[PDB]
Amino acid sequence: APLSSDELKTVVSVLAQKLDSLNIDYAIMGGAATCLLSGDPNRRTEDVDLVIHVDHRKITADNLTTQLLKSFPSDFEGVSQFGHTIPAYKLRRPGGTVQLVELEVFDYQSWPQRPQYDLQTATRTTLNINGQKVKLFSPEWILREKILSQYQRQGSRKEGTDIRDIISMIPLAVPGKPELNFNQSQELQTALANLVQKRPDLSSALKAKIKCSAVFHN
Numbered sequence: 001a002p003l004s005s006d007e008l009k010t011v012v013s014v015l016a017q018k019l020d021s022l023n024i025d026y027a028i029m030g031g032a033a034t035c036l037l038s039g040d041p042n043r044r045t046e047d048v049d050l051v052i053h054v055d056h057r058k059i060t061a062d063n064l065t066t067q068l069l070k071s072f073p074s075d076f077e078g079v080s081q082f083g084h085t086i087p088a089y090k091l092r093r094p095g096g097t098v099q100l101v102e103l104e105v106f107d108y109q110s111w112p113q114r115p116q117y118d119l120q121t122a123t124r125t126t127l128n129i130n131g132q133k134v135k136l137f138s139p140e141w142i143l144r145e146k147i148l149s150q151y152q153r154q155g156s157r158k159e160g161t162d163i164r165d166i167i168s169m170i171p172l173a174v175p176g177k178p179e180l181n182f183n184q185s186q187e188l189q190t191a192l193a194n195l196v197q198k199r200p201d202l203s204s205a206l207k208a209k210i211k212c213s214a215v216f217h218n
Ligand SMILES: [Mg+2]
Pocket: 030, 031, 032, 045, 046, 047, 048, 049, 104
């Protein structure tokens, strides 16, 4: 079930509380981030995707499952769909029953080919949900991911949502962040060329936020 905006906010505020209490640095990405930054309550998602920072304790994304189940047994339970146990938050509905919300957790050490997961350098932001600080990747970071995604998923059922997500993010971006400088990424240059070919009406709004000499000569 896609989570309502209210529900999503309950899930991430609790997760933020628990990660903070374990002193694990993190940032939320994916549909949750997009939804949290949306002005449209109809934009909804079904799980929470995040990156955590691994330090000397070696609480890797995989190892976090055990730590959550051990420290917060009231709030998390293990879910296994393909013989791999991951943590799910136990979202209580008003009538008292539990709706499981899966957590898709990543770390840089395990994905060296995704330097976007480096929490020490990625451009990031926070939201304050009724007093709780919730850590997210920034709109600039998200837009980079989405520009790539719309090209890689072109012709898929999700293409339209992606493009809608791009359009939502562009105005929240500011210029000058590394994630929106595409001069050293052939793959983002190509993805961007594909986007502005499809949606030339977005070209000036993107150009204001993105540095890419190949496409925008800026
Ligand atoms: Mg997701």
